[PDB]
């Protein structure tokens, strides 16, 4: 995006520490991570950083 966030960063951003919200975020994150292993598996989706250098783990 303009801020540098990828699909995985947005799922961290939209979380708000809620029961249903956390379950939805976790399910979607796991599904996207699994689907990333079938399409272009030569790259890692959990290493792309924003314009601030943060990764999804650090951003969380």
């Amino acid at each position: 995006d303009s801020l540098g966030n990828t699909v995985l960063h947005a799922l961290v951003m939209i979380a708000d520490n809620s029961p249903e919200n956390s379950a939805l975020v976790i399910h979607m994150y796991d599904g996207l991570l699994q689907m990333g292993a079938r399409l272009c598996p030569t790259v890692q989706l959990e290493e792309i950083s924003n314009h601030q250098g943060l990764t999804p783990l650090k951003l969380a």
Binding site: D16, E20, L24
Partner: protein, 43 residues
């Protein structure tokens, strides 16, 4: 709330004029007040 309702009247030597909030139609055959909110209430 009490302080707001008291100040809105104005000073005793100069009384002000009050104003409403929002404006809509009758919504079918009604000065409303918009309130946004965010909720993941099971869609």
């Amino acid at each position: 709330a009490i302080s707001v309702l008291e100040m809105e009247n104005g000073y005793w030597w100069c009384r002000r004029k009050k104003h409403r909030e929002g404006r809509l139609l009758k919504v079918g055959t009604r000065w409303c007040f918009r309130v946004e909110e965010v909720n993941w209430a099971a869609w």
